Design a protein around this nucleic acid. Structure first.
Lengths: 59, 59
DNA sequence: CACTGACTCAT
DNA sequence: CATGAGTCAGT
């Protein structure tokens, strides 16, 4: 029982460690994409104040 | 030093759990913002395949 | 000396 | 079976 719990803790922690690694990457990827879409919208609509419409969020 | 480490453990787990929650929130915040940007560009430049220029990030 | 990985216990 | 917390060992 002790052995099996030792296996489950390792798994939980990695689930956890990989889960943290995953959301750290996605947060960055989504943030960079957000920057790309804001620039593309600006290129197509040079007269539109994007930052005023869809305010930026911190990171 | 059992008291000190007990405290540091809780702290390390709060950071880790906090860090994870933080990135998750940033990722979710950016995603919703990006969806609003993609819609704005569609309704501003209807005849433009944005997905072929900047595909959606696999959440 | 504080931070963190990993084992154990109790949920 | 998964996880929050105390503990020990290593960073």
């Amino acid at each position: 029982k002790r052995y099996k719990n030792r296996v489950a803790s390792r798994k939980c922690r990695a689930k956890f460690k990989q889960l943290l690694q995953h959301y750290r990457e996605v947060a960055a990827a989504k943030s960079s994409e957000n920057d790309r879409l804001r620039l593309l919208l600006k290129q197509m609509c040079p007269s539109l104040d994007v930052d005023s419409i869809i305010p930026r969020t911190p990171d």
